């Protein structure tokens, strides 16, 4: 997708304050809470009973970090996204059996974590730009499912 220069720089600049370890963990844990059925992948993690142990599990944090990190790469490939995660779309599919709705799910709770992180700075124009990213990124990662 193409991004209006200032709408592309609102992404660029805001990302630089994001504590990817705090937001990465909170993005995944807050997802395992809110959309319960998303745990069908995270059974190896362990204790996910109450939303408490869900958020505090060192595996949830640990995996939310490398989930956000890879996101933090498509942020450079802000033109051709497919030729980036296409690799991970093979994985998440064939080998990992992951339903693409859950990616679309991640992008939205992430939009909320950021707004819970930057409060007022997360204006509507900035959220909107960050939507163009997450939706398009979600589709690139779920391009060739067969």
């Amino acid at each position: 997708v193409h991004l209006t220069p200032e709408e592309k720089s609102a992404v660029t600049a805001l990302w630089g304050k994001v504590n990817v370890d705090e937001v990465g963990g909170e993005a995944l844990g807050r997802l395992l809470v809110v959309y319960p059925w998303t745990q069908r992948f995270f059974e190896s993690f362990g204790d996910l009973s109450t939303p408490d142990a869900v958020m505090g599990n060192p595996k949830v944090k640990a995996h939310g970090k490398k989930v956000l990190g890879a996101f933090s790469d498509g942020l450079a490939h802000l033109d051709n996204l497919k030729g980036t995660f296409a690799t991970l779309s093979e994985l998440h599919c064939d080998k990992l059996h992951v339903d693409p709705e859950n990616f679309r799910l991640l992008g939205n709770v992430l939009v909320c974590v950021l707004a819970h992180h930057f409060g007022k700075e997360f204006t509507p124009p900035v959220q909107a730009a960050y939507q163009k990213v997450v939706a398009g990124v979600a589709n690139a990662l779920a391009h060739k499912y067969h």
Binding site: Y35, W37, Q39, D99, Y145
Partner: protein
């Protein structure tokens, strides 16, 4: 909610499916696995190819629940409670997938029941299933 006329069109259309119900089952599924590839991420244990007996047996079970469902149209939340707990807790199948099966199921009925599948019956059938899907996702959170 299903209107009285809806409940009449559903039983009238299902009555005509008959012994073929489990037959249409496997076909709604195959159409789903093939049309929406994403749907087969929930079947790593199933030989999903065509001819498959597993894709057939299961379709028979999918037929049986819509029959029990048609049988208890005024009490679906109690007649399908068992399956709703199976899909949300033990299967954890994302709610956006049922909308996917209900479509293939509907097409499968447009292919075998051309006489009965009028615009009125089509609509009552898109309702009946949306109501089933709903019940099946009641227990997700």
């Amino acid at each position: 909610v299903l209107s009285p006329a809806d409940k009449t069109n559903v039983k009238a259309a299902w009555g005509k499916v008959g012994a073929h119900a489990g037959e249409y089952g496997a076909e709604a599924l195959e159409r789903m696995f093939l049309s929406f590839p994403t749907t087969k991420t929930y079947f790593p244990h199933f030989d999903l190819s065509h001819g498959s007996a597993q894709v057939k047996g299961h379709g028979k079970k999918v037929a049986d629940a819509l029959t029990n469902a048609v049988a208890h149209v005024d009490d679906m939340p109690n007649a399908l409670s068992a399956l709703s707990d199976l899909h949300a807790h033990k299967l954890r199948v994302d709610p956006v997938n049922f909308k996917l099966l209900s479509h293939c199921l509907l097409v499968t009925l447009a292919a075998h029941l051309p006489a009965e599948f009028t615009p009125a019956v089509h609509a009552s059938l898109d309702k009946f299933l949306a109501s089933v899907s709903t019940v099946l996702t009641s227990k997700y959170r």
